[PDB]
Amino acid sequence: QQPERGKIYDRNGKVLAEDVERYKLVAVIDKKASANSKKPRHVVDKKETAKKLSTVIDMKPEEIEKRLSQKKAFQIEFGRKGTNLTYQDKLKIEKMNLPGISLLPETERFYPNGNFASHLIGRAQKNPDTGELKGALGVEKIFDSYLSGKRGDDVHLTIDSNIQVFVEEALDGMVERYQPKDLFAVVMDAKTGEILAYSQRPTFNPETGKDFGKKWANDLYQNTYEPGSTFKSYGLAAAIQEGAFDPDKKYKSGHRDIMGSRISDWNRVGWGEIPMSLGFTYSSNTLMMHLQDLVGADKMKSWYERFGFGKSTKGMFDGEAPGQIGWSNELQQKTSSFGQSTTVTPVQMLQAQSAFFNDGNMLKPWFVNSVENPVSKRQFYKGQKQIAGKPITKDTAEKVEKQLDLVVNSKKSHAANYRIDGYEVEGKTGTAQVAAPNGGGYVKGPNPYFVSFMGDAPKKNPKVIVYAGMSLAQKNDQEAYELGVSKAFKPIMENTLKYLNVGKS
Amino acid sequence: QQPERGKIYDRNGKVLAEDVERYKLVAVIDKKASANSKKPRHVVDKKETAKKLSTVIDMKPEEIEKRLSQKKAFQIEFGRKGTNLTYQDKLKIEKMNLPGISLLPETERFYPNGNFASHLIGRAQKNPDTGELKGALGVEKIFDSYLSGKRGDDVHLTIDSNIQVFVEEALDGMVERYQPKDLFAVVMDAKTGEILAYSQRPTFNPETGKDFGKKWANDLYQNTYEPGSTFKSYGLAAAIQEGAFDPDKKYKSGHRDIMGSRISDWNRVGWGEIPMSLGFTYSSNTLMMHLQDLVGADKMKSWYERFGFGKSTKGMFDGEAPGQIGWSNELQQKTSSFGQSTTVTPVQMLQAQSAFFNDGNMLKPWFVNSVENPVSKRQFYKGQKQIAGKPITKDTAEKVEKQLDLVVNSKKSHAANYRIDGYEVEGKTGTAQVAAPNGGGYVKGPNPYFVSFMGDAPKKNPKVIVYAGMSLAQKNDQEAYELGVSKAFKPIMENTLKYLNVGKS
Ligand SMILES: *C(=O)[C@@H]([C@@H]1NC(C(=O)O)=C(S[C@@H]2CN[C@H](C(=O)Nc3cccc(C(=O)O)c3)C2)[C@@H]1C)[C@@H](C)O
Numbered sequence A, B: 001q002q003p004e005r006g007k008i009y010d011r012n013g014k015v016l017a018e019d020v021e022r023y024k025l026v027a028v029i030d031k032k033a034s035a036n037s038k039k040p041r042h043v044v045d046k047k048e049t050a051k052k053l054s055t056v057i058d059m060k061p062e063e064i065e066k067r068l069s070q071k072k073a074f075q076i077e078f079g080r081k082g083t084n085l086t087y088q089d090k091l092k093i094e095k096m097n098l099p100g101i102s103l104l105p106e107t108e109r110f111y112p113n114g115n116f117a118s119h120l121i122g123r124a125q126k127n128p129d130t131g132e133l134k135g136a137l138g139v140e141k142i143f144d145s146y147l148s149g150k151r152g153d154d155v156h157l158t159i160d161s162n163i164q165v166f167v168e169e170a171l172d173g174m175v176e177r178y179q180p181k182d183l184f185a186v187v188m189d190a191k192t193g194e195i196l197a198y199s200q201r202p203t204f205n206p207e208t209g210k211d212f213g214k215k216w217a218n219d220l221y222q223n224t225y226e227p228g229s230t231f232k233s234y235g236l237a238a239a240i241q242e243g244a245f246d247p248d249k250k251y252k253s254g255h256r257d258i259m260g261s262r263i264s265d266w267n268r269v270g271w272g273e274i275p276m277s278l279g280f281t282y283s284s285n286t287l288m289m290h291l292q293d294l295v296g297a298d299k300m301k302s303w304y305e306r307f308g309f310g311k312s313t314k315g316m317f318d319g320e321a322p323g324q325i326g327w328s329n330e331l332q333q334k335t336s337s338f339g340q341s342t343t344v345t346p347v348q349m350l351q352a353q354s355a356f357f358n359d360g361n362m363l364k365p366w367f368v369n370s371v372e373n374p375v376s377k378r379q380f381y382k383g384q385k386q387i388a389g390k391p392i393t394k395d396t397a398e399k400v401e402k403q404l405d406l407v408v409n410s411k412k413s414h415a416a417n418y419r420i421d422g423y424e425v426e427g428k429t430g431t432a433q434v435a436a437p438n439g440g441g442y443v444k445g446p447n448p449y450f451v452s453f454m455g456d457a458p459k460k461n462p463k464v465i466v467y468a469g470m471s472l473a474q475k476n477d478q479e480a481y482e483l484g485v486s487k488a489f490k491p492i493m494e495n496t497l498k499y500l501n502v503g504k505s
């Protein structure tokens, strides 16, 4: 028999995955089993056996009887409906005292919460010959050789199930309303980098296997996005340190001509000669292009690299994507300033944003708290807060934070739909075009956007960062353009802050 | 967006896997798409569009109309039935000139032979957002970083498609006839170790994904078996080399009393005082136990290790199982002499068996011929024949081969069902009990056996080794006990020798 596979735990000791015993229904149907026996050891009345067994398994009495009639066979099973039976299903069948009926014990992998952080936890699959389980995605795969066994090691995550529930419920709401092609939300402790909650859509159910394999990629570590205007914060931070951003100095908005192409602010005309601070509140593309000119393209590329972009964060997930900084020509450089051409992972965005709230120190995000064996007490691994680098000074960080405050809370804001009543919110919005997966160019349509928000609360001294992103709503794409991910960000952030005992304004 | 993923080829350059273009059906249903256009650019007649589209995709006209009626939606797709469409499917729909209907090109992973060496080749899965493909089993996974791109590298196998066809057809026959729980066949070049064909049952279809994930374990490299009497050849080889086996010296058959358990020959009574050669032809358990006593338990354990058992063969498959030599106490030792308690992988058996046909040198089995890039011409890897060790002398090998010949061809043989008309065959049979995966005994029942044959032909100087094994037939289990895997070995071996131009007599 196999050693017990280790358990996966959340940060408070709740089981996310474990081994349980279930039962498989077996019917001996050959008369030769009762040749030299006092009481029958096979099924005598196929019809009565079918009726009574039908009251415990999800199979019609006609089908049980048909399967019971198979010839040249000593015993039969009943397919998917006959296995994974509970301990109460077992007791019910055995009271029936049906001749030739028995239940075989089987080990299964149990996920108590069903569809729940599924793309992070993953799923283990069973080799029916030996009962051996092997992880095929996420934590179950990454740590397969520790979890596997006389008893395997346990893996404790930084996930908080109470916060995970808020994220799962918000994402179900987004799917219902917007039916987007892709969707993710992540909650990170703003001061440690711990991943407190993470989910995506579409996803699978590790308990049932439903939809497993339809999308291999974990959004947090393996999928890449052109982030859009959330990426302007790192352009802004660079501009501040170089002395190029002055919040009150005016600049020419409108458009710029780059290698013969017209790139303009989102309203085509701009706002004339406006202060640089208002440019960022308005999410002016020409501000960012102007700032790049002042800093210099060469210096700006290094800045984005110093913020950790273009390379893996070296987390503990398999196949972490590196992204890439689009810098080949001046058109790629200029569109990178507002988050197109350059591709990122959500975990890179969390790593970079954390600098604004830790005196300029980027925090390496992390989700594995411990790998340890509960019998021997050996601890193999313990997660830690770690500074991934310090690209900016304390003063630049605070000056970035002042413009993020204004993005949500200026009189001239266009992001008031992210406000939560009783909590002070800040962050940056994004409404990015999405590259055509085959045809080249960008995906066309009425509002073909990846909409996102990189937010934190309470502002200035936040408890958590919440990053949510929604790609290509197929339903209500007008409203997705207007409201972004506000219908996910608000319940996630509000419920998280209350559960973390932060006081309402 | 994505580089072309490299191809998997067979040994003669036939494609086993490649990237193809397929098509996705898209319907624009919003009237606003035809606001400034003379001819309609959206679906005007839902009922006629559905009826006509119902003729190219597998969807009933009511459902096409129901999807076309979705509200707050600009474009709609048709789920799995609307994608993976062929180039002819495209031409047929475009001839209809339906307003608002179009086809998008999509890259798919194409397996030209469908269900074919599936657990060796594996399957790549697509991330719908980016089109990025990732191997999830077998070669597609093991070599994912080479196959992935630019243009990815090709992987050439030693598989011969012509011989693989013989193996797929033979295993289809065994399933229909025997409905076993597990089944495998492998064909290896007797002089190089090249794996010329390999398959198992149950398995999946890499092209459609049907049944993928139901069994993760590759039988050749990852599954373990109590081999049974096929393992006696290595006990025999040790005894020959140690001077303990003399073919004409008689021994007492019947039973031996081992730690209070009576272990007897398969006919319970034995054959009296018979020569050791006849003992082996009969698959005598007491012969192997007597020989083990003569050699010594300590010396015999080392012998099985020099035959490569108990450790991985260090092949190129992921997670190769090591097996284990069952040696805790004398009852484990003595049952190991006839292939119970000890567990092995089929690849270890091919490796050990090859010693008898290469002057005592074990050949390390291998299935990867080349990893190379067709653009740059860089070769990253080239497979080759490799000696895993020389545990026996040339003389011992010859004396083993003489007994394997007799097993099939003695007048007193019980393996005459493995004879092929016109070809001289040799090998060893096995009829082994199977450990219950849960609980602590053997699978009970009328014939609860893993039956197998380790055969080679022509005898003395074989071209290929054919190892087939069938675990726990649920249909015709009496016949499986009597005939073993003969109904698989014979068409596989006969068709292969003919394809290799070996002369029939
Ligand atoms: C960055 O992603 C992108 C530019 N930034 C943003 C952003 O979301 O911050 C946009 S979206 C643009 C600026 N905000 C405007 C807005 O919310 N207007 C609005 C509100 C409600 C209704 C309507 C309507 O009636 O359509 C409009 C719109 C901007 C594209 C970079 C890459 O350009």
Ligand SMILES: *C(=O)[C@@H]([C@@H]1NC(C(=O)O)=C(S[C@@H]2CN[C@H](C(=O)Nc3cccc(C(=O)O)c3)C2)[C@@H]1C)[C@@H](C)O
Residues within 6 Å of the ligand: B227, B228, B229, B230, B266, B282, B283, B285, B338, B339, B414, B429, B430, B431, B432, B433, B481, B482
């Ligand atoms: C090894 O696996 C096992 C012993 N070896 C083998 C073997 O397959 O070589 C067996 S099977 C045993 C010997 N061959 C006998 C047989 O085929 N008898 C037979 C043939 C046709 C009809 C009948 C019938 O009328 O029932 C019987 C059976 C043997 C168990 C070790 C582990 O013991």
